[PDB]
Amino acid sequence: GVNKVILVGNVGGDPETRYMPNGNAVTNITLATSESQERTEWHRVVFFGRLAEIAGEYLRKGSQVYVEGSLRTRKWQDRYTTEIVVDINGNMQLL
Amino acid sequence: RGVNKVILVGNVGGDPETRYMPNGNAVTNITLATSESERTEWHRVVFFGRLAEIAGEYLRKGSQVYVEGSLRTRKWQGQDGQDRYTTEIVVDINGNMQLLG
Amino acid sequence: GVNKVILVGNVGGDPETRYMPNGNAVTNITLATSESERTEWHRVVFFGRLAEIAGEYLRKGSQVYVEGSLRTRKWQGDRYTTEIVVDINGNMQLLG
Amino acid sequence: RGVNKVILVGNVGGDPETRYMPNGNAVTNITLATSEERTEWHRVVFFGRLAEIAGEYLRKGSQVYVEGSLRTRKWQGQDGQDRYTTEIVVDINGNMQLLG
Ligand SMILES: O=c1c(O)c(-c2ccc(O)c(O)c2)oc2cc(O)cc(O)c12
């Protein structure tokens, strides 16, 4: 099928970049979207590949960024987290 | 102030479930599968307003459907006491639904 | 069916804000998106509340997100112009 | 520097015309109808791997999901007068899905 997320919002904190011994950077952020009384929505966005390098270097707290990715719910130690995964199939644009 | 948009095409995982609020407004919950090659991602999709009556009347298990909505993450304490979060795709007047095939 | 366009780019000139016989507000812009150098120019038309805002807050050079629908309009002077219509079914957001 | 995205769900208006460049790579053209009443007709062109698939599995009146980007091409008609044609390009950066 089709699994597509498009966000424009504000980065809630400094990007967390870690490296995989196969070299590849991964970059996690929080991104805030709000609709207007006003209510904010927080999104867990995970960058992979070169976009992770670009993200983990250009983005800061309060950055306005455009993001295009896929929804992925992952199980971990049970807790579930639905992250927006942004890889070569996705896109990002600094605003 | 920003943009919060989800577009899914996939297959309904079970018959829908429609609830009528005391006011008369319908709320229709479904699960929605999307596949990449094979990983299947299961999505929680909730319809409000006019689209909830149409989703409930027309979506059935195995229906192929297009969905446009927004991401909403609901927080709740589990019976163990611990925080939990449930991210849903909300389809309301600002979203869209089309029955496919 | 489904007819959806999402754009992020820069406003080409300044918004041209006219009104209709309704008194409805309409706001035309051109909007440039770049690909990897090559620049695509989009003709974008706002209606209703979003047209008033586009004229109020867009200037030449300002960075915008727009969401709308493709409309191929006909005119004779026999032609065709494809437009991204951004009305109550769409969205716009001032970036930068 | 920007974002240029079109998403459509509709019905192919004709039988896909498939063509082949001197590089052999596939180029297939269709129309696609979207409608609410009002019917909007779209010029969609496929390239690369997705051009090959649009040829075999799309027919007159078939429903399809397409994801691509807008491209307007300029051409002088047989008047010398400028004309424009806006298409939806669906290449390796786009997406397509047969429905049903
Ligand atoms: O009434 C509507 C409306 O307000 C909006 C909307 C959603 C998000 C925005 O950011 C915005 O500016 C407008 O979408 C719609 C989409 C529909 O299919 C039908 C509608 O009636 C609305």
Author numbering:
A (entry chain B): 4 to 39, 49 to 89, 95 to 112
B (entry chain A): 3 to 39, 50 to 113
C (entry chain C): 4 to 39, 50 to 90, 95 to 113
D (entry chain D): 3 to 38, 50 to 113
From the reporting publication:
Single-stranded DNA (ssDNA)-binding protein (SSB) plays a crucial role in DNA replication, repair, and recombination as well as replication fork restarts. SSB binds to ssDNA with a high affinity regardless of the sequence and prevents premature annealing, chemical attacks, and unwanted nuclease digestion. Bacterial SSBs typically recognize ssDNA via a highly conserved oligonucleotide/oligosaccharide-binding (OB) fold formed from a five-stranded β-barrel capped by an α-helix. In this study, the effect of the flavonols myricetin, quercetin, kaempferol, and galangin on the inhibition of Pseudomonas aeruginosa SSB (PaSSB) was investigated.
The complexed crystal structure of PaSSB with quercetin was determined at a 2.3 Å resolution. Four monomers of PaSSB were found in the asymmetric unit. A quercetin molecule could be found in a cavity created at the interface of PaSSB monomers A and C. However, unlike the complexed structure of PaSSB with myricetin, which contained two myricetin molecules per tetramer, only one quercetin molecule was found in the structure of the PaSSB tetramer. Having a similar binding site to myricetin, but with a different binding pose, the quercetin molecule was sandwiched between PaSSB monomers A and C. The binding of quercetin did not influence the overall structure of PaSSB. Residues Ile105 (monomers A and C), Asn106 (monomer A), Gly107 (monomer A), and Asn108 (monomer C) within contact distance (<4 Å) were involved in quercetin binding. Gly107 and Asn108 formed hydrogen bonds with quercetin. In addition, compared with myricetin, the aromatic ring of quercetin shifted by a distance of 4.9 Å and an angle of 31° for hydrogen bonding to the side chain of Asn108 in PaSSB. Based on our crystal structure, we found that in the absence of one OH group, compared with myricetin, quercetin could not interact with Lys7 and Glu80. Thus, quercetin did not inhibit the ssDNA binding activity of PaSSB.
